[PDB]
Design a protein around this nucleic acid. Structure first.
Ligand SMILES: NC[C@@H]1O[C@H](O[C@H]2[C@@H](O)[C@H](O[C@@H]3[C@@H](O)[C@H](N)C[C@H](N)[C@H]3O[C@H]3O[C@H](CO)[C@@H](O)[C@H](O)[C@H]3N)O[C@@H]2CO)[C@H](N)[C@@H](O)[C@@H]1O
Lengths: 98, 86, 72, 41, 91, 136, 19, 116
RNA sequence: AAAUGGAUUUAAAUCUCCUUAUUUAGAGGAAGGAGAAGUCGUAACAAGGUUUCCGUAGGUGAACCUGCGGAAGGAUCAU
RNA sequence: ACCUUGUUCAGAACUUAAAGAGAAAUCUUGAGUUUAUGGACUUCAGGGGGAGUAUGGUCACAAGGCUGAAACUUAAAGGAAU
RNA sequence: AUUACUUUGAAUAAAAUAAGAAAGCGAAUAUUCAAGCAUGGGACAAUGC
RNA sequence: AUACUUGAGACAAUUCAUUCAAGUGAGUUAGGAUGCCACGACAAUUGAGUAACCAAUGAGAAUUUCUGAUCUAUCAAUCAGUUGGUAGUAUCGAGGACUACCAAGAUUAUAACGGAUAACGAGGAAUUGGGGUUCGACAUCGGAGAGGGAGCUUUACAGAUGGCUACCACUUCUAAGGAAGGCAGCAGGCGCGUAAAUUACCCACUUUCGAAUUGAAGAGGUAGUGACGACACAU
C-alpha cells in the first residue's frame, strides 16, 4: 500500500513525473501503529517489535514537540521525563529524567 | 531483477578466462567464497606484484607513493604507475 | 564611427563629470511647449541611452553606488 | 545484431555500370593494403 | 556568428533552416501516416494524355482494404484483389 | 536558538570535529551558539568524494543557499562550445555569517539531507557587493 | 614575483612598490 | 571595430605582397608571428607603435581552435598547399611556434594562422 | 483459533463537468488544381497603340479602369 | 570676407582601367582583398504553383497588419547576354 | 586563485571495428567520445584581486 | 522427525543513559567501562546436520553525486508537499517518503512548464576523403511488462502473475447445482497485413536447479522448412 519512492512527487521546477513502472516492494511503507507489543516481519527476515500500547518503562538518571494532538501517544522525544527510544520500532519505552 | 543472478553468459564472462565466443551459450558461474567473480577462476594479464590494472603480471620494486586525500593513492614501481590495490 | 549618427570624424588632440554633462537631458525635457517636435523626442531617447550606458558603466567601476537611477 | 558468426564481402561492383574502357580491359565470370601503406606514409 | 563560444546559435540556426528542405520535411511531419495512401508501405493490396501526346491511357480505380480511400492505378503492359506499387517517381 | 517546540541539542553531547582533505574549521563554528544537526563541523555529517564550487545565487532559504555553476559544453559538429549552467541547493551552517549572494564557495558532497539538498558549504570567499547584502 | 594571489603581489605592482 | 590585430595585420601584408608594408597597431602576437615567418625566410609611438617576393598568402584563422597533436594532420591537409611548402602558426604553452617544433616540442594548443 | 461486526490505510470499478488525438455530416457551401482543337473580349510583351509596375481607395461580365503617392525594372545617364 | 593656388580631414558624386571580381550586364570609396575557401554580429532563402491561402494566435473602431502551413499539381519557372 | 586550454598517465564488460575464402581461435592487440581523477606547462583566454 | 515444542550442558548480539578513547583526508568512530532492559544458544540431530554473532563473497543488490537525449514558441511563464526548517512517524536504511508546527520559497529565454514520436537506452550497424547523415524491437549489459488497473501471500530476494484476491474485458467445461484460465515460453490456429518456418527428436555440447557425480531442463544441442543475406564453386 504505502510507498516511499519519489516517483509520485514533482521536480524542483514543478514538473509532474510520468509513470514508467508500477509500485515495487522495496519501497514498502507501513501503517503507523501509534503507541497509545506486536512483531512485524521486516525485510531480510529480521523482526520489528511493534508496541501497540504500553505503560511501564525503564528510565535512567503532557507535551509533544511535533503534534499537540498526540497529547497520549508514545513517541521519541515526548515528555511524560523525555522518551529517548523508538517505541514503535524497538517495542519498549526507554527514557531519561529531565 | 527480482533476485540475485545465477546463470552466466559466454560473452559476459571475464576476458582473461580465455573462453571462446562460440563454444557454448553459457559460462560456468563462480560460486561465492574467498575470491570474487572477476578476481578468480572457477604480464599477458620491497618488491611487489600487480594484480589489477594494466600492470597485472608485472613484478618490481616501488620507488615512491604519492597520496591524494580526495580519491585514491598511487604506487610507482620499477617505471610504471598504478593504484595500491593492484 | 559615431555612436548614433553615421558620421566618422577624427578631430582629436594629439599629446606630444561627463555623466553630469549629459543631464542636456533636462535641457530638452523644452518638450513641454513643443509637444509636436518629434525630432526632439527622437534625440531625447538617444541622449537617454547614453546616460544608461554610462550609468551601467560607472556602477561596475564602483564610481557610483549601484542605487543610482536617473529619473525626470 | 543478428548472428555471432562473422561475415564479409569479398568483392565490390564498380560505380559506373557501363564504360567501354572497362568492358574491354576486364574482358568463369567477372566476380586494402594500399591505404594501409598510405596511412603510414 | 563564428566565435568559439557561439555553438548555440549555429546549432539553432541549422535546425530552423532544415524545415525549408522539401525532401527532408516530408519525411518528418505527419503526412506519411495520414496523407500517403500507401502509408509508409511499399505495395498495397486493394479492390487522355498531356498536350503533345494523343491517345487513351487505360487505367483502374481501386479502393484500399485498410484505409478505404479510392486511387487511380495504371495497367502495366500492352493489352493488359490487386497489388499496386507506385511508379518511377516517389510520391 | 531554542525558538522551536523541542529542546534543540547537539549530536555528540558530553563538540567540534574537523573536515578532511585540507580544510579549516571556521571560527564561528566553535564559539557560535547555533545548534545545527546538519552542520559539517559540529555534527555527524561527513564530506565524501565529490567536491564542487560556484557562486551563490540565493540566500533567502533558512540555513540553505543556492549555488550556481557555469561551464561549457563542447559540441562535436561545430567544434565550438556553448555556455551552460546548473543550480544545486547546498546546506550552509551558521558557521558562516558574512556569506552573501555573489560569493564563491567550495562545497562538498554529503548524504541526502532533503529532496534537493545533498551538499555542504566548506570554505567561502566573498566578492564585491551586488548592491543587495542578502545573507542566510 | 609569483607564478602566473592579489594584485598587491604582481610584478609591476610590487616592482613599482619596490621602486 | 578593430577586433583582432593579427587578422588586420596579415591582410595588410598579403595585399601589399600581391601588389615593404606597414602595421599600425603592434601586439605581443603580431610581432612574434613574424619571427616564425622570418625564420622560414618568407619575410626579410607610446600607443602600441607601428617583403621579398616570397610570401604567397598569410592569413589568420578565426576562432583559435584548440589543436590536439593528433589533430595536426587534419589542419595541414586543409590549409597547406602541399606537404612540403607551407607552415601553420600555433600558440602553445611554450610560445608561438609552427607545426614543425610543436610536433617536436610534443604539445598542442590553439592555432593562429598560416603562410604559404 | 475459524465465521462475523466496526474503524483506518491502499484503492480497483463506476457516475458528473473539464483537458488531447481519430472519425460520420446534408440543404448551406466556398476555394484550388489537371485534361489538343468550346464562348466573350485586348489586358500584358514594340511607345503593345492610354509607358509599365508597387501601395492604397473606389467601380466594374471579364481581362481591368480611374484618383493620391512612389519606382525605372523607361521610351531620358544629355542643354 | 568673395574670388586664384598648396597642404593635409569630413561629405555627395563623377572619369579611365591592359588590373581584381563576376554567368554576364556591370562593380572599383566594392559586387575586390573567397576552393590560396575563417575580421565581429544580426536577419533572410532553398525548383515552379497551391499561397501570404487555410487553421490557430494576436494588434485595430474598421479596411487590414504581424505569425503562417498542408493536401494536391508540374519539368520546368527564372537571370544576363547573341 | 580557480577555470578553460594543452602533455602525459591511472582507470576503463565482452562481442563487434581495425589489426598480430567467408570462417574459427589469446595479438603489446589500440580504441570508445562526453564527463570525472592525478600530473608537467602558462603562450592565447574567462572569472575577482 | 533435522516437522513443533519444553528442557541444559554456562555466553553472543539489540535499545537506552553516562564515561575512557587509536584507523581513516575526515568521526564521542571500530573498541573498552558503568546500570539497565530486551534476546538467548552451539538440534534431546543423522551415517554429515544445527542456532546467534563477526568477516568475506560484495566492485555485488539498492539508493545516490557529476556530465551527456530527438522535434516543437501555432508551448512563456510554471509549482502549493510546492522549496526549505524543526520534531516525530515509516522504512533494510538517507530523505516531504509521510504527519504536525514555522518560513516563502523552487524553476525559467543558457528554453522552464507543456506538447509529439510510427522513443526502451547503451555496447553497435549502414554509408562515408576529411567532416558528417540515418538506423539500433531484435546475440551481450541495464530497464519495464505478462489482457487492463489495484490489493496481497510465502520467502533471503516478488508488488511474482506457467501464486492468490476483487473489479473491468474475454476464454473454456457443465449432469444446469456448479467449475478454470491467462502463449509478449516452444511448436501450432485465426485475425492483421506488402511482410515472416516444424503442432520433430534428445539431455550427448554449454550451463543451471535439486535431499545431488545418476534426476530435470521447448534453457541447450540435433534434425525440418528457409534465392533474407554471406563464402567457394558446375554448365
Ligand atoms: N490554372 C488555373 C486558372 O485557369 C484559368 O483558366 C482556365 C480555363 O478557364 C482556361 O480555359 C481555356 C480557355 O482559356 C481557352 N480560350 C480555350 C481552352 N479550350 C480552355 O482550355 C481549358 O479547358 C478545356 C476544356 O475542354 C480543357 O480541355 C483544356 O485542357 C483546358 N486548358 O484554361 C485554364 C485552365 O483550366 C486561367 N486561364 C489561368 O490563368 C489560371 O491559372
Amino acid at each position: 500500500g504505502i510507498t516511499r519512492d519519489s516517483r509520485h512527487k514533482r521536480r524542483a521546477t514543478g514538473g509532474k513525473k510520468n509513470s514508467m513502472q508500477k509500485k515495487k516492494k522495496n519501497t514498502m511503507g507501513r501503517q503507523p501503529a501509534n503507541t497509545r507489543v506486536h512483531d512485524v516481519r521486516c525485510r531480510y527476515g529480521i523482526i520489528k517489535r511493534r508496541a501497540l500500547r504500553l505503560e511501564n518503562g525503564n528510565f535512567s538518571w503532557v507535551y509533544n514537540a511535533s503534534d499537540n494532538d498526540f497529547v497520549n501517544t508514545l513517541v521519541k522525544g515526548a515528555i511524560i521525563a523525555c522518551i529517548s527510544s523508538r517505541p514503535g520500532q524497538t517495542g519498549s519505552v526507554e527514557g531519561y529524567i529531565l | 531483477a527480482r533476485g540475485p543472478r545465477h546463470h552466466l553468459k559466454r560473452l559476459n564472462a571475464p576476458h582473461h578466462w580465455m573462453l571462446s565466443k562460440l563454444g557454448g551459450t553459457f559460462a560456468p558461474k563462480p560460486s561465492h567464497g574467498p575470491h570474487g567473480m572477476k578476481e578468480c577462476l572457477p604480464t599477458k594479464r620491497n618488491t611487489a606484484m600487480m594484480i589489477g590494472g594494466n600492470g597485472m603480471g608485472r613484478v618490481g620494486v616501488i620507488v615512491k607513493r604519492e597520496v591524494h586525500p580526495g580519491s585514491f593513492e598511487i604506487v610507482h614501481i620499477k617505471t610504471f604507475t598504478t593504484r595500491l590495490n593492484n | 564611427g559615431r555612436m548614433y549618427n553615421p558620421g566618422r570624424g577624427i578631430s582629436r588632440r594629439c599629446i606630444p563629470e561627463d555623466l553630469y554633462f549629459l543631464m542636456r537631458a533636462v535641457s530638452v525635457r523644452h518638450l513641454e511647449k513643443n509637444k509636436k517636435d518629434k525630432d526632439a523626442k527622437y534625440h531625447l531617447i538617444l541622449i537617454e541611452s547614453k546616460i544608461h550606458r554610462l550609468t551601467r558603466y560607472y556602477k561596475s567601476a564602483k564610481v557610483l553606488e549601484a542605487s543610482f537611477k536617473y529619473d525626470a | 545484431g543478428r548472428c555471432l558468426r562473422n561475415h564479409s564481402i569479398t568483392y565490390k561492383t564498380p560505380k559506373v555500370p557501363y564504360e567501354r574502357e572497362r568492358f574491354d580491359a576486364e574482358l568463369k565470370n567477372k566476380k586494402h593494403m594500399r591505404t594501409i601503406a598510405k596511412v603510414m606514409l | 556568428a563564428r566565435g568559439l563560444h557561439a555553438a548555440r546559435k549555429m546549432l539553432a540556426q541549422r535546425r530552423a533552416n532544415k524545415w525549408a528542405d522539401k525532401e527532408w520535411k516530408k519525411g518528418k511531419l505527419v503526412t506519411r501516416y495520414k496523407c500517403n495512401p500507401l502509408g509508409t508501405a511499399s505495395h498495397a493490396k486493394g479492390l487522355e494524355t498531356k498536350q503533345p501526346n494523343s491517345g487513351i491511357r487505360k487505367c483502374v480505380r481501386v479502393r484500399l482494404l485498410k484505409n478505404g480511400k479510392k486511387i487511380t492505378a495504371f495497367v502495366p503492359r500492352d493489352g493488359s484483389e490487386v497489388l499496386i506499387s507506385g511508379f518511377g517517381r516517389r510520391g | 536558538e531554542q525558538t522551536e517546540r523541542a529542546y534543540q541539542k547537539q549530536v555528540f553531547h558530553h563538540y567540534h570535529k574537523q573536515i578532511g582533505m585540507g580544510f579549516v574549521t571556521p571560527a564561528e563554528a566553535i564559539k557560535g551558539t547555533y545548534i545545527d544537526k546538519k552542520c559539517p563541523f559540529t555534527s555527524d555529517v561527513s564530506i565524501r568524494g565529490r567536491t564542487l564550487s560556484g557562486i551563490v545565487k540565493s540566500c533567502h532559504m533558512k540555513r540553505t543557499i543556492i549555488v550556481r555553476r557555469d561551464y561549457f559544453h563542447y559540441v562535436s559538429k561545430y567544434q565550438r562550445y556553448e555556455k551552460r549552467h546548473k543550480n544545486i541547493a547546498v546546506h550552509c551552517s551558521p558557521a558562516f555569517r558574512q556569506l552573501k549572494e555573489g560569493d564563491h564557495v567550495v562545497i562538498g558532497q554529503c548524504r541526502p539531507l532533503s529532496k534537493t539538498v545533498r551538499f555542504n558549504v566548506l570554505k567561502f570567499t566573498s566578492r564585491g557587493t551586488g548592491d543587495k547584502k542578502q545573507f542566510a | 614575483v609569483a607564478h602566473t594571489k592579489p594584485r598587491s603581489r604582481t610584478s609591476k605592482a610590487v616592482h613599482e612598490a619596490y621602486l | 571595430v578593430r577586433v583582432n590585430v593579427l587578422a588586420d595585420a596579415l591582410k595588410s601584408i598579403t595585399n601589399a605582397e600581391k601588389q615593404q608594408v606597414m602595421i599600425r597597431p603592434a601586439s605581443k602576437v603580431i610581432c612574434e608571428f613574424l619571427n616564425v615567418m622570418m625564420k622560414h625566410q618568407y619575410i626579410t609611438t607610446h600607443r602600441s607603435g607601428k617583403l621579398n617576393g616570397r610570401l604567397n598568402k598569410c592569413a589568420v584563422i578565426s576562432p583559435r581552435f584548440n589543436v590536439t597533436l593528433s589533430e595536426f594532420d587534419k589542419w595541414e591537409a586543409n590549409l597547406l598547399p602541399s606537404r612540403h611548402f607551407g607552415a601553420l602558426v600555433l600558440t602553445t604553452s611554450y610560445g608561438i611556434l609552427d607545426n614543425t617544433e610543436a610536433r617536436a616540442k610534443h604539445t598542442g594548443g590553439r592555432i593562429l594562422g598560416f603562410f604559404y
